[PDB]
Enzyme design. Structure first.
Site, PDB file in Angstrom:
ATOM      1  N   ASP A  50       0.911  -1.292   0.002  1.00  0.00           N
ATOM      2  CA  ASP A  50      -0.080  -0.065  -0.143  1.00  0.00           C
ATOM      3  C   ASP A  50       0.713   1.143   0.117  1.00  0.00           C
ATOM      4  O   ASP A  50       1.292   1.766   1.122  1.00  0.00           O
ATOM      5  CB  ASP A  50      -0.942  -0.094   1.253  1.00  0.00           C
ATOM      6  CG  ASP A  50      -1.725   1.113   1.475  1.00  0.00           C
ATOM      7  OD1 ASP A  50      -1.959   1.903   0.213  1.00  0.00           O
ATOM      8  OD2 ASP A  50      -2.265   1.506   2.552  1.00  0.00           O
ATOM      9  N   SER A  84      -0.560  15.469 -12.174  1.00  0.00           N
ATOM     10  CA  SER A  84      -0.613  15.298 -13.469  1.00  0.00           C
ATOM     11  C   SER A  84      -0.887  16.367 -14.418  1.00  0.00           C
ATOM     12  O   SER A  84      -1.391  17.428 -13.751  1.00  0.00           O
ATOM     13  CB  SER A  84      -1.913  14.383 -13.581  1.00  0.00           C
ATOM     14  OG  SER A  84      -2.356  14.039 -14.928  1.00  0.00           O
TER      15      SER A  84
HETATM   16  C1  LIG Z   1      -4.154   4.084   2.084  1.00  0.00           C
HETATM   17  N1  LIG Z   1      -4.436   3.324   0.702  1.00  0.00           N
HETATM   18  C2  LIG Z   1      -5.690   2.784   0.564  1.00  0.00           C
HETATM   19  C3  LIG Z   1      -6.286   2.009   1.241  1.00  0.00           C
HETATM   20  C4  LIG Z   1      -5.623   0.631   1.359  1.00  0.00           C
HETATM   21  C5  LIG Z   1      -6.221  -0.315   2.037  1.00  0.00           C
HETATM   22  N2  LIG Z   1      -5.434  -1.748   1.880  1.00  0.00           N
HETATM   23  O1  LIG Z   1      -5.884  -2.559   2.568  1.00  0.00           O
HETATM   24  O2  LIG Z   1      -4.353  -1.904   1.362  1.00  0.00           O
HETATM   25  C6  LIG Z   1      -7.169  -0.368   2.763  1.00  0.00           C
HETATM   26  C7  LIG Z   1      -7.837   0.849   2.794  1.00  0.00           C
HETATM   27  C8  LIG Z   1      -7.352   1.987   2.051  1.00  0.00           C
HETATM   28 CL1  LIG Z   1      -8.368   3.237   2.013  1.00  0.00          CL
END
Ligand SMILES: CNCc1cc([N+](=O)[O-])ccc1Cl
EC number: 3.4.23.22
Length: 330
Positions: free
Chosen positions: A35, A199
């Site tokens: 993530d 962008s």
């Molecule tokens: C913080 N990046 C988005 C996010 C990733 C995850 N994840 O499980 O990888 C979960 C919620 C969000 Cl909102």
């Protein structure tokens, strides 16, 4: 040093991607969601409330000869989708694709919210945003990438996500066979702790390119592409019968449609997202209304270049002293 690991969609819609990670001694392999929008490495564990575990593989620190409690440390995180998790912290050896970090903070969940429980395929998250967002208290901890950086051949990692197919996360090198043409690099602001960039504009289908600055984050942990309401309206206006549904929670379109592509600018370069990448299928089983992969960021507070956008490119997360982001077509 370098590392290279395959990342695999969790389902037929590419709702998320999981990457195997080795934790502890002997290794315990957990499948984590990498993530780039957060900075905590947390796992389902032997400490996770039993009723909140449903099929996940757990980390058991008592079975690792290299695990050590990080005494007094706790963590608690809330994500943009309203999900959350919290617990305590161990240090242990963590390896990704052959790249090993010793003394990595491994955040052991005591509690997780329902959406984590319900995703049996995701055993935790591995955060790859900047360490300034890490939630461990009272001593903030570093991400896997930040810990690895000094040992890496080059201070970079790359995301090469597949469309309905596996892809690759590489650490420490750029695989020049994994993309076509050249990589266009663009400036990053770390002020909010994200891989935040601007962008240079967009086009819908075969339409003319609109030059306009769109600040947003490169977030491998977000499924969809979230952009300003003006941009998103212009896209869905090209799809007969598409509409924003407050009951569903976003733009939906007739499943009989053929979706146009969407182009975003990176400097003077252009990344084209094929229309098929924007189809997230029936809103409920058997429905003829389909969920769109481009949605409004209004109310989120930030634009998010999530997997819909990133999987159309080979993406370089350059963690040199002045960080930058690179995009190439592939
Ligand atoms: C913080 N990046 C988005 C996010 C990733 C995850 N994840 O499980 O990888 C979960 C919620 C969000 Cl909102």
């Amino acid at each position: 040093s370098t590392g290279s690991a395959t990342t695999t969609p969790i389902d037929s819609l590419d709702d998320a991607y999981i990457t195997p990670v080795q934790i502890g001694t002997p290794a315990q392999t957990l499948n984590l969601d990498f993530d780039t929008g957060s900075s905590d490495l947390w796992v389902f564990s032997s400490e996770t409330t039993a009723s909140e575990v449903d099929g996940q593989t757990i980390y058991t620190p008592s079975k690792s000869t290299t695990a050590k409690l990080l005494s007094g440390a706790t963590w608690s995180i809330s994500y943009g989708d309203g999900s959350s998790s919290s617990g305590d912290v161990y240090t242990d050896t963590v390896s990704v694709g052959g790249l090993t970090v010793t003394g990595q903070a491994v955040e052991s969940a005591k509690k997780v919210s329902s959406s984590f429980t319900e995703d049996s395929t995701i055993d935790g998250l591995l955060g790859l945003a900047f360490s300034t967002l890490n939630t461990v208290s009272p001593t903030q901890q570093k991400t896997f990438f930040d810990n690895a950086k000094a040992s890496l051949d080059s201070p970079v990692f790359t995301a090469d996500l597949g469309y309905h197919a596996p892809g690759t996360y590489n650490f420490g090198f750029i695989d020049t066979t994994a993309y076509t043409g050249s990589i266009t690099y663009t400036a990053v602001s770390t002020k909010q702790g994200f891989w935040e960039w601007t962008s240079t504009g967009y086009a819908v289908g075969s339409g003319t390119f609109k030059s306009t600055s769109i600040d947003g984050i490169a977030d491998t942990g977000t499924t969809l592409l979230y952009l300003p309401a003006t941009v998103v309206s212009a896209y869905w206006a090209q799809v007969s019968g598409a509409k924003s549904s407050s009951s569903v929670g976003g733009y939906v379109f007739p499943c009989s449609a053929t979706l146009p592509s969407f182009t975003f600018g990176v400097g003077s370069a252009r990344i084209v997202i094929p229309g098929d990448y924007i189809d997230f299928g029936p809103i409920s089983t058997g429905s003829s209304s389909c969920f769109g992969g481009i949605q409004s960021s209004a109310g989120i507070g930030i634009n998010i270049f999530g997997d819909v956008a990133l999987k159309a490119a080979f993406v370089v997360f350059n963690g040199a002293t002045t960080p930058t982001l690179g995009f190439a077509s592939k």
